[PDB]
Design a protein around this ligand. Structure first.
Ligand SMILES: Nc1nccc(-c2c(-c3ccc(F)cc3)ncn2CC2CC2)n1
Length: 351
């Protein structure tokens, strides 16, 4: 027996939500999901409720919808976005078509903080520590964010950070073109599709964010893919034979070999005036060869986070079954798996 829902039209959208959600008011929306803010009388939190657009209009959308629910249902870390509730007014799979997702309402992101100037080393420490702590958790479940950037990091008045907007599911093509922030935090190997990318593509992203927090400037603000690749190599140095061997495209390798070689620059002469520990860490993160990049787990142990590092308080995730990613099903099959996931949702406890 479900709760009582109440219909209501907001900005030309019908929202059927349980009574517990009161004072709904638009807070934006995307081509992916319409979002309303509201007070959840059950928990006492202000929440963000998203009504997915056309969750099952296609197999890709049906699958993406399914993937997002599984992902959100699995994330249970204080530095990662959680699912407070998921629901559908649908009384049966027969009528199942709408999916609403609820999470803590987030005010500002990392931009509404960096964009104001450089940050104190203590703040960069804390903010990066949290990104890596959640990343350790995300990576431990064999999940790759793929889209870490300031606009995807929620930050509150007490500098408490949460990672959201998981990459997987979205494919930002023609949005990675030109002078766009969406590409400035992308690892070179994934940006030019040099090889199959690993979890450290996320570590490269943290590096760009850390640097930007220290200097107050974007690290690689390329006007396009190539301009950006040049900015990167100028700092990091051109690839060696070891790395070249790993680039699977003969064209990419050919292109790369056309570039005059460059040595790695001196980071202390780049991040002038920065805590040497921050500079050191940045060197372990901003490594061209993804194989030799530092891991989230290893970074947390770095001496730069001595003030915050606590091995007993940097949990990993429960196993995350992604076998469905290979599963080949019909729209209706994804829809039903999705409905099971909605139906089976167990909310996180209160206190
Ligand atoms: N204010 C605010 N706070 C938190 C999350 C979001 C959020 C969610 C989103 C993601 C997961 C959910 F469960 C609900 C909503 N989807 C998009 N946005 C922001 C876009 C709407 C402006 N917006």
């Amino acid at each position: 027996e479900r709760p009582t829902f109440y219909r209501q039209e907001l900005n030309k959208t019908i929202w059927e939500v349980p009574e517990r959600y009161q004072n709904l008011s638009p807070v934006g929306s995307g081509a992916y999901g319409s979002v309303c803010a509201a007070f959840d009388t059950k928990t006492g939190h202000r929440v963000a409720v998203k009504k997915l657009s056309r969750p099952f209009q296609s197999i890709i959308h049906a699958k993406r919808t399914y993937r997002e629910l599984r992902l959100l249902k699995h994330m249970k870390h204080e530095n990662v976005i959680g699912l407070l509730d998921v629901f559908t007014p649908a009384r049966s799979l027969e009528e199942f078509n709408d999916v609403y997702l609820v999470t803590h309402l987030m005010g500002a992101d990392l931009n509404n903080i960096v964009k104001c100037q450089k940050l104190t080393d203590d703040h960069v420490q804390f903010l990066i520590y949290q990104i890596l702590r959640g990343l350790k958790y995300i990576h431990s479940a064999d999940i790759i964010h793929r889209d870490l950037k300031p606009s995807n990091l929620a930050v509150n008045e007490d500098c408490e950070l949460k990672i959201l907007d998981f990459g997987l599911a979205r494919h930002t093509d023609d949005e990675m073109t030109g002078y766009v922030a969406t590409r400035w935090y992308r690892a070179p190997e994934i940006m030019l599709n040099w090889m199959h990318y690993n979890q450290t593509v996320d570590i490269w992203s943290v590096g760009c964010i850390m640097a930007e927090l220290l200097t107050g400037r974007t690290l690689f603000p390329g006007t396009d893919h190539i301009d950006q690749l040049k900015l990167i190599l100028r700092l990091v140095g051109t690839p060696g034979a070891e790395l070249l061997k790993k680039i699977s495209s003969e064209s990419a390798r050919n292109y790369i070999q056309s570039l005059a070689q460059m040595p790695k620059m001196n980071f202390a002469n780049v991040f002038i005036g920065a805590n040497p520990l921050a500079v050191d860490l940045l060197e372990k993160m901003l490594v061209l060869d993804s194989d030799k990049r530092i891991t989230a787990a290893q970074a947390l142990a770095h001496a730069y986070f001595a003030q915050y590092h606590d091995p007993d308080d940097e949990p990993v995730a429960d196993p995350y079954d992604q076998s469905f990613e290979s599963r080949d099903l019909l729209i209706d099959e994804w829809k039903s798996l999705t409905y099971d996931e909605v139906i089976s949702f167990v909310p996180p406890p209160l206190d």
